[PDB]
C-alpha cells in the first residue's frame, strides 16, 4: 500500500527529485530518521543521495535528490505513505494579508509600494539553456502585474490590501511542485508563529494533477487559509491540473469583456466541475516592471485568480471571522449568473462548467451545486458528490447522457452525508449532483421511506413538527434479474411531499432551523424540446430539484444556480423545493 506517483504529462516530469510523504502522525524526529535511513541504505548500495529539505508543519516527509534506481528501496522504508516524483509548474476596516507565490516583484512600483513585502523566500529551478542570461531583465513582470491586479492604487481590486511575496517561478515563469510545497510550508509556519488575522494565498500557477500539492492545499484550507488558484490556460479539464483540481482551493477560470471564455493563442481558459467560478482575465491593465509608473495589459487565468483574491481580501477586511465555506458561498452568491457563452467549451463539459463571473457584494441561506466525477460503465458503478465540512447536504439528483439510471441516495459516509448516484444495467455511467448549503442553526437529517406499492402509505414528508422538506432522492428498488414492468408514480395530494415511483425507496432531507421556510414549485411541458425549467424567485434559494416522470422520458435533473433543469428525451415536469431563512 506504499505507492509511487509521477506526472501524467511526460514533458513536465523532473526525475531525480522525489517527495517522500510519510503517515499522518509521523513526528519530525521520525522524518529525519527515515531520511537518514534512506541515505545510509543508498550509500550501502553505492549511491550518493542529498536530502534537500525535511518537511514539518504542513505535512510529514522529506525531499530527496537520488537516482530513480533507489525508488523500490525508498518504497520499502518505514512510515512511507507514498512517493511523488517532482514536476514543473508554470505561470498562468481590518488588515488582511495576501500571500503571492509567483515571480520576483517590483516592490517600489507606485501602484503597489508600501503594500507589498518581499519575504526573502526563494525556491526556483535553474533556467533552460546553457547560455541563458536575464541581463537587463529583473524577472519581475508576472508577479508585479498580479500584485497590481490584487491591490494596485489605481488599477487594483482591493486597494487597501497587505501583500507578502514568495519567489516560486524563475525568469521563464517555471517552478516545481517541490518549491511550491516548501513555499506553502513557509506560509503555514508563519501562521503558527504570527497572528490570528485572515490569510489569502494566491497560486497563479498550474501543473499536472499532483496528489501531494492537492494534500498540502487541503491542509492549509483546513487550517483556515483561503487559497485562490488559476484554472489553467490549456483549454482543458482543470481536474487534470494542480492546484486547480484540489476541491478546497477556489479555482478561477478567465472570461473577457464580451462575456466569452478567454482564448490564449490555440488554447485558453480551462473548464469543468473543478472550476469554482470565472472572472475578468483578458486585456487586464496592471502594473508593469518596465518603470515605476508603467502599466501593461495581460491575459490568463492567473489574472482572473488575482481578481478573486482581491474580492476575498475585501470581503475578509469587512467580516474577518468569515470561514472558507462562507466565503466560497458568498463569492458564488454575488457573481453574475448565466452570462457566459458556453458554446466555446466542449459540449460534454458545458453542464459541468459553472456559469458564474465573479463580482463584489453591493441571516441568510446560501446553496451551491457540486457535480461529481462521472461513474464508470460497470452496472453497479456509482458517482459521489461531497459537501464542504461546514455545509449541509440538502438534496441529491443524478444525470446520465443516455438516461440509464437507478436513481440516487443521500447516505452517510464517514459520519457526513454524501450524494451517491447509481448506474443502471446497460448504462454508460452517471453523475451525482449535490446541493451544499450553509443554513444557520440547522438540525438536518435524511429519513428513508420504503417502496410503497400498497394502496396507502405513499406520501413521504417531514412529518416532525418544526422539520421542513428541503430535498428528495429516489432509488429504484427492483432487481435487474426481476421481471421489469413500467414504473407507477406515487399519487399527489399534499403539495409538500416527495414525488417518485411506488417501486422506489425515497430519501427525504428534513431540516429544523429557526426561521426556515421552504416551498415546492413545478412546471411541465407536454412534449419538451431538450429541457424543462422552473426557478426560485428573488429572495428564495433552490434547495432541491427533481424530475417527472422517470427514465422513459428523462435523462436526469440538476440545479443551475436557482433553476431546476430537467433534461428530457426526444408531460415532462421540473419539481423544485425553494427555501429561505427568516
Amino acid at each position, epitope marked *: 500500500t506504499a505507492t509511487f506517483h509521477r506526472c501524467a504529462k511526460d514533458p513536465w516530469r523532473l526525475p531525480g527529485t522525489y517527495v517522500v510523504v510519510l503517515k499522518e502522525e509521523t513526528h519530525l524526529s521520525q522524518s529525519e530518521r527515515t531520511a537518514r535511513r534512506l541515505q545510509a541504505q543508498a550509500a550501502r548500495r553505492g549511491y550518493l543521495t542529498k536530502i534537500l529539505h525535511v518537511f514539518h508543519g504542513l505535512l510529514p516527509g522529506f525531499l530527496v535528490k537520488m537516482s530513480g534506481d533507489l525508488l523500490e528501496l525508498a518504497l520499502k522504508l518505514p512510515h512511507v505513505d507514498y512517493i511523488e516524483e517532482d514536476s514543473s509548474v508554470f505561470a498562468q476596516g481590518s488588515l488582511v494579508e495576501v500571500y503571492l507565490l509567483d515571480t520576483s516583484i517590483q516592490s517600489d512600483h507606485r501602484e503597489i509600494e508600501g503594500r507589498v513585502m518581499v519575504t526573502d523566500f526563494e525556491n526556483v529551478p535553474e533556467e533552460d539553456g546553457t547560455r541563458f542570461h536575464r541581463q537587463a531583465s529583473k524577472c519581475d513582470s508576472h508577479g508585479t502585474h498580479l500584485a497590481g491586479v490584487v491591490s494596485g492604487r489605481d488599477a487594483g481590486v482591493a486597494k487597501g490590501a497587505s501583500m507578502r511575496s514568495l519567489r516560486v517561478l524563475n525568469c521563464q515563469g517555471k517552478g516545481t511542485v517541490s518549491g511550491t510545497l516548501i513555499g506553502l510550508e513557509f506560509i503555514r509556519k508563519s501562521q503558527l508563529v504570527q497572528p490570528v488575522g485572515p490569510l489569502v494565498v494566491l497560486l497563479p500557477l498550474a501543473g499536472g494533477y499532483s496528489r501531494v500539492l492537492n494534500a498540502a492545499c487541503q491542509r492549509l484550507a483546513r487550517a483556515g487559509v483561503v487559497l485562490v488558484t488559476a484554472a489553467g490556460n490549456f483549454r482543458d479539464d482543470a481536474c487534470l491540473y494542480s492546484p486547480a483540481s484540489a476541491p478546497e482551493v477556489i479555482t478561477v477560470g478567465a472570461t473577457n469583456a464580451q462575456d466569452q471564455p478567454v482564448t490564449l493563442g490555440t488554447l485558453g481558459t480551462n473548464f469543468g466541475r473543478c472550476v469554482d467560478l470565472f472572472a475578468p482575465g483578458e486585456d487586464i491593465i496592471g502594473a508593469s516592471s518596465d518603470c515605476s509608473t508603467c502599466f501593461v495589459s495581460q491575459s490568463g487565468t492567473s489574472q482572473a485568480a488575482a481578481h478573486v483574491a482581491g474580492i476575498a481580501a475585501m470581503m475578509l477586511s469587512a467580516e474577518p471571522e468569515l470561514t472558507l465555506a462562507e466565503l466560497r458561498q458568498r463569492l458564488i452568491h454575488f457573481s453574475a449568473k448565466d452570462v457566459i457563452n458556453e458554446a466555446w467549451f466542449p459540449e460534454d463539459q458545458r453542464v459541468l462548467t459553472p456559469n458564474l463571473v465573479a463580482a463584489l457584494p453591493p441571516w441568510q441561506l446560501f446553496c451551491r451545486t457540486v457535480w461529481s466525477a462521472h461513474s464508470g460503465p460497470t452496472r453497479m458503478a456509482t458517482a459521489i458528490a461531497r459537501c464542504a465540512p461546514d455545509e449541509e447536504l440538502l438534496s441529491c439528483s443524478s444525470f446520465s447522457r443516455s438516461g440509464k439510471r437507478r436513481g440516487e441516495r443521500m447516505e452517510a459516509q464517514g459520519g457526513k452525508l454524501v450524494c451517491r448516484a447509481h448506474n443502471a444495467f446497460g448504462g454508460e455511467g452517471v453523475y451525482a449532483i449535490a446541493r451544499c448549503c450553509l443554513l444557520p442553526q440547522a*438540525n438536518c*437529517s*435524511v*429519513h*428513508t*421511506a*420504503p*417502496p*410503497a*406499492e*400498497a*394502496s*396507502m*402509505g*405513499t*406520501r*413521504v*414528508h417531514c*412529518h*416532525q*413538527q418544526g*422539520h421542513v422538506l428541503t430535498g428528495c432522492s429516489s432509488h429504484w*428498488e*427492483v*432487481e435487474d434479474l*426481476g421481471t421489469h414492468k413500467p414504473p407507477v408514480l406515487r*399519487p399527489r*395530494g399534499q403539495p409538500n411531499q416527495c414525488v417518485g415511483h411506488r*417501486e422506489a*425507496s*425515497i430519501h427525504a432531507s*428534513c431540516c*429544523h432551523a429557526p426561521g426556515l421556510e421552504c416551498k415546492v414549485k413545478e412546471h411541465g411541458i407536454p412534449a419538451p424540446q431538450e429541457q424543462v425549467t422552473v426557478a426560485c424567485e428573488e429572495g428564495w434559494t433552490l434547495t432541491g430539484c427533481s424530475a417527472l416522470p422517470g427514465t422513459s422520458h428523462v435523462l436526469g435533473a440538476y440545479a443551475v444556480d436557482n433553476t431546476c433543469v430537467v433534461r428530457s428525451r426526444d408531460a415532462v415536469t421540473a419539481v423544485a423545493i425553494c427555501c429561505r431563512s427568516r
Partner: antibody, heavy 124, light 108 residues
Framework: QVQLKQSGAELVRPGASVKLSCKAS????????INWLKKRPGQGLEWIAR????????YYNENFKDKATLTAEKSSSNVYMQLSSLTSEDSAVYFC?????????????????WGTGTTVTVSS | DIVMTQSQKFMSTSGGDRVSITCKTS??????VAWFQQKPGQSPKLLIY???NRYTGVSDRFTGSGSGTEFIFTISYAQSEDLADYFC?????????FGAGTKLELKR
C-alpha cells in the same frame, strides 16, 4: 382469524442454508406487506426485510442484503425467507409480521399481527 | 441508523400505581414510535402506536407520550398478568430500529 403461522424450529450445520416460511390467512394475502425480524437473546429486534406479495418486490436492511432472500407464493398463501452461509451469529428466533396502513402517510401504519417465531440453531 | 436507547428497569411513582420506561432516539422521529408487549414464547402484541394512540382492545391502563427524541410508556395498576417484556420502535426511517426490551418486575 387474521393470522401468521410460522414453520417449526430448525437445526443447521455452519455454512448451510434454511428456508423459513410464514403462512398467512384470514385476509387478502397480496394486499399487505410482510416483514422478517431477528431476535437474539440479550438484543433488541433487528428488522431484516419486507416483501409485497402482490408483486413479490423486496426491500432489505443493507446489513442482511447478502444473508436473506425473501419470496412470496400466492397459491400457497405464504412468504419465505432463505438465510444462506449460516454461522453461530445467525442462531436466533425469527419472526414474521404484517404492516397495516391506515393513511396516505408513510408513517400511518403499524405491525398489527405477528407469528410466534421460529428458533434457528446453527451447530455441528 | 436511528438508535433506540430504552430504560434498564421500570421506574415507580404514586406508590407503585404508575410504573414507567423511557425510550430515547438518536434523531428526531416526530411521533413515529410504537410500543409492544411480549410474553415469553408468544408473538409481540401492539399496545401504543404513533407515540400515544392505543391499539384496539388495549386496556386504558397502558399509556404512551412524547415527541421528537424522548418517549415514555406507563402502566397504571400493573397486574401479575402484565408481567412481560416491553419494547419501543421507530418507524420514521428505514432500517426500522427497536429498543432492547425491559422486563416488568412487581412487588408482592
Amino acid at each position: 382469524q387474521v393470522q401468521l403461522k410460522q414453520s417449526g424450529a430448525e437445526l443447521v450445520r455452519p455454512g448451510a442454508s434454511v428456508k423459513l416460511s410464514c403462512k398467512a390467512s384470514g385476509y387478502i394475502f397480496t394486499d399487505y406487506y410482510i416483514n422478517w425480524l431477528k431476535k437474539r437473546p440479550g438484543q433488541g429486534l433487528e428488522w431484516i426485510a419486507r416483501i409485497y406479495p402482490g408483486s413479490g418486490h423486496t426491500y432489505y436492511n443493507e446489513n442482511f442484503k447478502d444473508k436473506a432472500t425473501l419470496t412470496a407464493e400466492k397459491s400457497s398463501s405464504n412468504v419465505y425467507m432463505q438465510l444462506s452461509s449460516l454461522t453461530s451469529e445467525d442462531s436466533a428466533v425469527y419472526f414474521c409480521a404484517r404492516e397495516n396502513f391506515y393513511g396516505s402517510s408513510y408513517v400511518d401504519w403499524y405491525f398489527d399481527v405477528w407469528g410466534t417465531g421460529t428458533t434457528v440453531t446453527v451447530s455441528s | 441508523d436511528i438508535v433506540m436507547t430504552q430504560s434498564q428497569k421500570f421506574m415507580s411513582t404514586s406508590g407503585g400505581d404508575r410504573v414507567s420506561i423511557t425510550c430515547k432516539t438518536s434523531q428526531n422521529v416526530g411521533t413515529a414510535v410504537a410500543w409492544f408487549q411480549q410474553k415469553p414464547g408468544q408473538s409481540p402484541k401492539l399496545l401504543i402506536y404513533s407515540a400515544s394512540n392505543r391499539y384496539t382492545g388495549v386496556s386504558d391502563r397502558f399509556t404512551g407520550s412524547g415527541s421528537g427524541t424522548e418517549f415514555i410508556f406507563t402502566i397504571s395498576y400493573a397486574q401479575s398478568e402484565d408481567l412481560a417484556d416491553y419494547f419501543c420502535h421507530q418507524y420514521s426511517s428505514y432500517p426500522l430500529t427497536f429498543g432492547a426490551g425491559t422486563k416488568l418486575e412487581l412487588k408482592r
